Amino acid sequence: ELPSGAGLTADSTPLMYQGLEVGQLTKLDLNPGGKVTGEMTVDPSVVTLLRENTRIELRNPKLSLSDANLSALLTGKTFELVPGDGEPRKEFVVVPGEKALLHEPDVLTLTLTAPESYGIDAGQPLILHGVQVGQVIDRKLTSKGVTFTVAIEPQHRELVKGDSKFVVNSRVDVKVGLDGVEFLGASASEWINGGIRILPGDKGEMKASYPLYANLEKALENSLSDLPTTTVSLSAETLPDVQA
Amino acid sequence: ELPSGAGLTADSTPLMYQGLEVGQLTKLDLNPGGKVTGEMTVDPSVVTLLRENTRIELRNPKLSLSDANLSALLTGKTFELVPGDGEPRKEFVVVPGEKALLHEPDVLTLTLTAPESYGIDA
């Protein structure tokens, strides 16, 4: 059950497992209602891998800066078998390559709010301790502002622990001080990738929503808003004092 | 015993030694359990180099900024024979190109801790 047979050709697009062709997309049709379906023959040696949570991911070719493989660029779209376990099944729903993380046997899905996108998009990485542990699934605009949905891999799921803070890394911010020479938000190699930094906590509950802090300092201050609350008010007639 | 036959084609990917083709990957199969294996015929003139710690490295083509060789880009994956010494052997385990330094007769392996990646990758 395809999302849209954009680059798919009948009898040409292969099912690809461990780098070896296993199956061949045979039929590709447009059902009424705009739905696109198809069917694929697989090698009998692999049918045991078609189980309940076995999934098939449509993968786009990607430009590898390290290994510029021309063949991958020429073949275009590809199917990929990633097996699971359970009862055998025959009907399948193809997940797009970006949503592949969303459909996993155990994946940590979070919804985090923000007043602004800050340049964060739906393909950005998601960094903990300088290493990617997840991905931004998508970005939805609401009346109050942006809400993102993000996903965390199961192997790193146990390191967030209910308390954490999420900091924007997609925007550079150079601050200058008399002693405060600092470059917050990103490094140049990491700014092109963008992403969201995670400040992990100790213990918690994995609550449903988390605020998104525009920089590290506001995350430390636990100051999601912009205007701090008036701790106290003073009345003075004429004083040559600070405006703010 | 391949990691994954990603760019490997049977009867096409060569074994490459000193820049000269020596061998040809003949058979390439998926064993049960997800394991990928294969077998390769080598020239009899080179069988003496297949010894105990002789290793075979799968090498990806790389974009040389100095010598943009189009042929290397077109051939894709390559095998490379780097000989060793000891008893002759026939079964082999292909090391990926990145892990090639890890499998050497003498290599100094260190584990170093950090509180953060600092952008350091593998």
Compute the 3-state secondary structure of chain A and give helix, strand, coil in percent, each to the nearest 5: 10, 35, 55
Report how far residue A205's alpha carbon sits from residue A203's, in angstroms, rounded to the nearest whole number.
Answer: 7
Q: Is A19 in Cβ contact with B119 (below 8 Å)?
A: no
What lies within 8 Å, CB to CB, of A86 at 6+ separation is A51, A52, A53, A54
Task: Name chain A contacts of B6, Cβ cutoff 8 Å.
Answer: 18-19
Tell me how far CA of residue A58 lies from CA of A80, A96, A128, A146, in angstroms: 6, 5, 28, 28
> Cβ–Cβ contacts within 10 Å for residue A120, how many?
24
Tell me how far CA of residue B13 lies from CA of A12, B9, B25, in angstroms: 22, 6, 6
Report how far residue A161's alpha carbon sits from residue A203's, in angstroms, rounded to the nearest whole number.
Answer: 5
Tell which A residues from 35 to 64 touch B, by Cβ distance under 8 Å: 45-46
Report how far residue A101's alpha carbon sits from residue A149's, in angstroms, rounded to the nearest whole number.
Answer: 12
Q: Name the phi and psi angles at A73, rounded to 5.
A: -65, -35
What lies within 8 Å, CB to CB, of B115 at 6+ separation is A129
Residue A143 gets the label, from left (phi > 0), alpha (psi -120 to 50) or beta, of alpha
In terms of Cα–Cα distance, which of B95, B61, B120, B63 is closest to A129? B120
Pairing state between β A164-168 and A209-213:
parallel
- Enter the tokens of residue B22: 């020596």
DSSP B45-58: GGGGG--TT-EEEE
Q: Is A19 in Cβ contact with B7 (below 8 Å)?
A: yes
E runs forming strands in chain A: 14-17, 20-30, 36-42, 55-59, 78-82, 95-96, 108-113, 125-128, 131-141, 146-152, 164-168, 173-175, 182-184, 196-200, 209-213
Residue type, B26: T
What lies within 8 Å, CB to CB, of B66 at 6+ separation is none
Q: Which of A18, A45, A189 sits opposite B119 (nearest CB)?
A: A189
Pairing state between β A108-113 and A146-152:
antiparallel
Q: Is B7 in Cβ contact with A18 (below 8 Å)?
A: no
Q: Name the phi and psi angles at A188, rounded to 5.
A: -65, -40
Contact A114, A123 (CB under 8 A): no
Number of Cα atoms under 13 Å in the Cβ half of residue A213: 19
Tokens 């290994």, residue located: A67
Q: Which of B8, B74, B120 sits opposite A19 (nearest CB)?
A: B8
Task: Name chain A contacts of B63, Cβ cutoff 8 Å.
Answer: 65-66, 68
Report how far residue B79's alpha carbon sits from residue B36's, in angstroms, rounded to the nearest whole number.
Answer: 16
**Length in residues, chain A:** 244
Q: What is the dihedral of CA B12, B15, B21, B27, to 10 degrees?
A: -40
Report how far residue A94's alpha carbon sits from residue A42's, in angstroms, rounded to the nearest whole number.
Answer: 15
Tell me how far CA of residue B66 lies from CA of A63, A128, B62, B63, B76, in angstroms: 20, 37, 11, 9, 19
Q: Name the phi and psi angles at A206, rounded to 5.
A: 50, 70
Report how far residue B74's alpha carbon sits from residue B94's, in angstroms, rounded to the nearest whole number.
Answer: 22
Quick check: B34 contacting A, CB < 8 Å? yes
- Enter the tokens of residue B47: 């069988």
Report how far residue B75's alpha carbon sits from residue B79's, in angstroms, rounded to the nearest whole number.
Answer: 11
Tokens 């990617």, residue located: A132
Residue type, A56: I
Task: Name chain A contacts of B118, Cβ cutoff 8 Å.
Answer: 130
In terms of Cα–Cα distance, which of A67, A77, A74 is closest to A97? A77
Quick check: A107 contacting B, CB < 8 Å? no
Quick check: A192 contacting B, CB < 8 Å? no
